[PDB]
Design a protein around this ligand. Structure first.
Ligand SMILES: [Zn+2]
Ligand SMILES: [Zn+2]
Lengths: 9, 75
């Protein structure tokens, strides 16, 4: 699913 | 639309009070796309998604349906 703010820092 | 919508009737994300929760958040709430109808964005926290579930959702191509719409999608 498309998401926002789910990338590992 | 953006990060600061009221995403559902119980949405508790507010630009005047938000703080990070998920380990991937810094200054903006994590969101996920619901594929019902024309599609819409919801805050992951407002859906009560655990971090593990959110990460699995973000890593795959499966469609997501939010808590208000998933019963309709599975019917
Ligand atoms: Zn919300
Ligand atoms: Zn929905």
């Amino acid at each position: 699913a498309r998401t926002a703010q789910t990338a590992r820092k | 639309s953006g990060y600061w919508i009221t995403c559902c009737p119980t949405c508790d994300v507010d630009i005047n009070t938000w703080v990070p929760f998920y380990s991937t958040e810094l200054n903006k709430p994590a969101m996920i796309y619901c594929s019902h109808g024309d599609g819409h964005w919801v805050h992951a926290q407002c859906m009560d998604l655990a971090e593990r579930t959110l990460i699995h959702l973000s890593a795959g191509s499966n469609k997501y349906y939010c808590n208000e719409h998933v019963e309709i999608a599975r019917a």
